[PDB]
Design a binder for these strands. Sequence first.
RNA 1: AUUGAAAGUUGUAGUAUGCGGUCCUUGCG
Length: 112
Amino acid sequence: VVKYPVNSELANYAEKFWKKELAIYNLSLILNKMTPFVKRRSESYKSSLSAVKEIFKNVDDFQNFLNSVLRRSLDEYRVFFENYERLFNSFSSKIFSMRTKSRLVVGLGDES
RNA sequence: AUUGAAAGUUGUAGUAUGCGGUCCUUGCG
């Protein structure tokens, strides 16, 4: 039971897309607006990330779907990055690059 | 049968010139 709290036509469109049938590219749009409420048996329609993972075939499957959706915007991200680097160089700013020692999370407490 | 009868405070004329809602601050234990 993946009933959505959105008007019926967008509800069925989101249902169609959610089962890896379409190629919606804005990951934020999928996550924020068309939220897949899950009503697993013997329980009300919860909305936690655990239920969302239960909707997908496996945790790896959900991770792959998210990675694909994120990677789908590569060209736009590249153009934006070129503009950003041009801005950095234009203002005469020192730029460097590091890497994450371990896992990172910023703004975990943002309310959703 | 009177210091009386008579006479448009009226014409033109831009509340206008200058000015950054800005500074400080980890969404987190």
